[PDB]
Amino acid sequence: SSKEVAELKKQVESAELKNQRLKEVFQTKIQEFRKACYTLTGYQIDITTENQYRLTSLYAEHPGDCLIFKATSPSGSKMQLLETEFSHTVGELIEVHLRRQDSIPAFLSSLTLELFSRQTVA
Amino acid sequence: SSKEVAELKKQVESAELKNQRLKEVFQTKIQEFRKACYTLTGYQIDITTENQYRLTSLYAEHPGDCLIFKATSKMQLLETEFSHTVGELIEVHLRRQDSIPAFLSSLTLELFSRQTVA
């Protein structure tokens, strides 16, 4: 009605639209980064509801196969592998690379190469 | 009315607060997500000033060594000083196998082998 009420409605409109663009801009670049990490590293990294990290391989044999890592603390860099149905199947890779070598990148690299070799044409 | 003016001023503050928060939690979450992707995969994924993806390995032997990938569904590796040092890996895994993940995985394992102590 009044010009003062109008001006305030246009400010509410303006803010609720900043919203709509921050979401959509935070929406593409997040996916851009994740789909890029997928295409490059071969791992689809999701953040679970418990703020842990679920990894699915580009060369996974079954769609539900995944690994879950958790960060021990925000103020640290250590991470730990949690038990999944699929991690049950790679105990040898875990022993060699996670336990004896203590290198998650070496573990996921060795797992990627192993899964790649298993995914034959026929 | 002063009634509506007061209610709207509060709405503007509320709307601005919702946007301000969206900024702070995004900042914390992706830096958490970025640190997690780096610790897990062993690669620092930076989106460069040309919408390109430059990657740095946790086991990079010399500061400045990097790989740059250009985006278009398929992604092309561009020329860098470090690209030339691994021509052998590029031939086996990027062209024969047509797999960037197999390429970067083989690179990480090779870099990790030469990074070891004693």
Partner: peptide, 21 residues
């Protein structure tokens, strides 16, 4: 466990949904 303010929870509810696929 002070509780997050409604503006911090709402933003975290959508930002974390975008990290899940």
């Amino acid at each position: 466990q002070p509780s997050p303010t409604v503006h911090t929870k709402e933003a975290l509810g959508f930002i974390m949904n975008m990290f899940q696929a």
